[PDB]
């Protein structure tokens, strides 16, 4: 294993720039860095990405994020839902999914 959440910040982080100023899995839920990340990594995956002023610009952000890595080749049951981060229901499978990212990213 790569490592379990320590080493996700720092990585994700370092792409777009923002070092998550708040909660770890709350800053997710918002939906920016990480929309910004996976466009690194999958071209025009979430270029769209809505600032979340709002509510339901978070709920857009989420889903393109998940349904591109979903299908980008990270595998469902190693993903966490738009629902789960959203609700911040799942704790630990929002951070797994990070950690499969990250081999389908370093094979790219």
């Given at each position: 294993?790569?490592?379990?959440?320590?080493?996700?910040?720092?990585?994700?982080?370092?792409?777009?720039?923002?070092?998550?100023?708040?909660?770890?899995?709350?800053?997710?839920?918002?939906?920016?860095?990480?929309?910004?990340?996976?466009?690194?990594?999958?071209?025009?995956?979430?270029?769209?990405?809505?600032?979340?002023?709002?509510?339901?610009?978070?709920?857009?952000?989420?889903?393109?994020?998940?349904?591109?890595?979903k299908?980008?080749?990270?595998?469902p049951h190693?993903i966490?839902?738009?629902?789960?981060?959203?609700?911040?229901?799942?704790?630990?499978?929002?951070?797994?999914?990070?950690?499969?990212?990250?081999?389908?990213?370093?094979?790219?």
């Amino acid at each position: 294993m790569p490592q379990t959440e320590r080493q996700l910040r720092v990585w994700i982080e370092g792409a777009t720039g923002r070092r998550i100023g708040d909660n770890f899995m709350d800053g997710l839920k918002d939906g920016v860095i990480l929309c910004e990340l996976i466009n690194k990594l999958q071209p025009g995956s979430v270029q769209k990405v809505n600032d979340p002023v709002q509510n339901w610009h978070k709920l857009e952000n989420i889903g393109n994020f998940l349904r591109a890595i979903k299908h980008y080749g990270v595998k469902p049951h190693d993903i966490f839902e738009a629902n789960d981060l959203f609700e911040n229901t799942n704790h630990t499978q929002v951070q797994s999914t990070l950690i499969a990212l990250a081999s389908q990213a370093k094979t790219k």
